[PDB]
Design a protein around this nucleic acid. Structure first.
Length: 162
RNA sequence: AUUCAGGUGAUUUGCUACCUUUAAGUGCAGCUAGAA
């Protein structure tokens, strides 16, 4: 798994079908909204899932929740690092997506945080792929709401631009 | 941005574990000190 960004035009396109697809453009954003890399690959679809910085309501989400994978520094549980917002993962196409360039990124606190996350994610990368698969299944069966319409997105995301 | 999926313990507060391939109750607190 790796960090990605997603072209604004592609986010805009999907937003047309499901208004829950994560926002890309925002003036509060210091860095681009970062997505986490191939969280689930099934039936030809590859999903990326948006990372999100900590909010107040995060304390209430259970570790067992299918909607989020809470992130923290390896072996320092009190160093919370936001969460992978699985409920808003989206299918992608290689063309409209590009890896963060960690190689050439100047050393900033942000880059340092990126690496604390990368390690925790890599370490728990089976759990994360397993939550995703289950979350998708429940949504497709109608048992869960509040998420991206996977069934719909999976039907339209390959058209673009026609 | 998008402000908590449902379920598993002859019992179960909180968190955690577990299971959603129709399967699943572990751990630490909590309360407890009962009698074959």
């Amino acid at each position: 798994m790796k960090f990605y960004t997603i072209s604004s035009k592609y986010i805009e396109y999907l937003k047309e079908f499901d208004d829950k697809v994560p926002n890309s453009e925002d003036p509060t954003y210091q860095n681009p909204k970062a997505f986490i890399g191939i969280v689930l690959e099934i039936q030809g679809h590859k999903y990326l899932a948006p990372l999100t910085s900590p909010k107040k309501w995060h304390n209430n989400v259970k570790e067992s929740s299918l909607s989020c994978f809470k992130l923290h520094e390896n072996g320092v549980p009190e160093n919370q690092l936001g969460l992978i917002n699985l409920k808003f993962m989206i299918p992608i196409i290689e063309a409209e997506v590009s890896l963060l360039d960690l190689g050439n990124m100047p050393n900033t606190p942000y880059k340092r945080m990126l690496y604390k996350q990368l390690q925790f994610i890599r370490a728990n990368s089976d759990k994360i792929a397993s939550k995703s698969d289950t979350l998708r299944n429940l949504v497709l069966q109608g048992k869960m709401q509040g998420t991206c319409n996977f069934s719909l997105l999976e039907e339209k995301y390959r058209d673009f631009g026609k």
